């Protein structure tokens, strides 16, 4: 649904891929673990490992990320955290 | 805040520390961002960096962890994911 | 820079008084948020910057206490 970016330390190209990848994942999958898995795998392929993704309606996180590889955004009411670490 | 461990790849001593640490965090802090932050910091100090913690009621994830440094458990209705990566 | 250890100690002694400003700002923020209609963009940005600076500052000091010697 509508993409709203709250935080990002990430290039413009990777930001757009984050939304696009999450958009496809959310359309294709219903289960959060599978939505997250789709998003992560796509980034590992195009932008190299090691990416991590959490997708959900209710969570907080405190993580460490690689510089220029962090975004936090919503698609409708669903929050997506997408970053590299390792 | 009763603790139930669902899955772990972690030594028994670190598993117990995770539950006790998360339990203390959950008693002290109301907001997941702060609970996660408490938990992460305690592990970086005692078990070296780089730790990551996600705390919440509704999420899925797909992550990569270091062997022997992974736990996923609940405190009551709140799920905590605690692992090392990087 | 065989003098800079003095500034190191001073910063450690000063921050216990300066750092509470952050919580004080939040405690008052509780009200500003409501009355200002959420128009707190400047406050949020500054808080985010502080988060960064505070974590970095502690990290440096934790290293300095051992590397400075």
């Amino acid at each position: 649904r509508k993409a709203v970016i709250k935080n990002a330390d990430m290039s413009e190209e990777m930001q757009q891929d984050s939304v696009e990848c999450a958009t496809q994942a959310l359309e294709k999958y219903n289960i959060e673990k599978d939505i997250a898995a789709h998003i992560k795998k796509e980034f590992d392929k195009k932008y190299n490992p090691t990416w991590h993704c959490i997708v959900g309606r209710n969570f907080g996180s405190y993580v460490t990320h690689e510089t220029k590889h962090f975004i936090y955004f919503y698609l409708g009411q669903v929050a997506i955290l997408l970053f590299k670490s390792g | 805040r009763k603790a139930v461990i669902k899955n772990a790849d972690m030594s028994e001593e670190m598993q117990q520390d995770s539950v006790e640490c998360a339990t203390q965090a959950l008693e002290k802090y109301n907001i997941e961002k702060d609970i996660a932050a408490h938990i992460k910091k305690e592990f970086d100090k005692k078990y070296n960096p780089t730790w990551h913690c996600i705390v919440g009621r509704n999420f899925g994830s797909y992550v990569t962890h270091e062997t022997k440094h992974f736990i996923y458990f609940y405190l009551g209705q709140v799920a905590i994911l605690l692992f090392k990566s990087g | 820079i065989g003098d800079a250890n003095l500034q190191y100690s001073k910063l450690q002694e000063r921050k216990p008084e300066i750092l509470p400003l952050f919580q004080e700002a939040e405690d008052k923020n509780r009200l500003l948020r409501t009355v200002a209609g959420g128009g707190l963009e400047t406050i949020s940005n500054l808080k985010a910057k502080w988060d960064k600076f505070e974590l970095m500052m502690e990290s440096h000091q934790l290293m300095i206490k051992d590397q400075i010697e």
Binding site: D9, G60, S61, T64, T67, F83 | - | L55
Partner: peptide, 8 residues
């Protein structure tokens, strides 16, 4: 390494 801490 050049890493950063963050939270959501």
């Amino acid at each position: 390494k050049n890493t950063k801490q963050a939270y959501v």
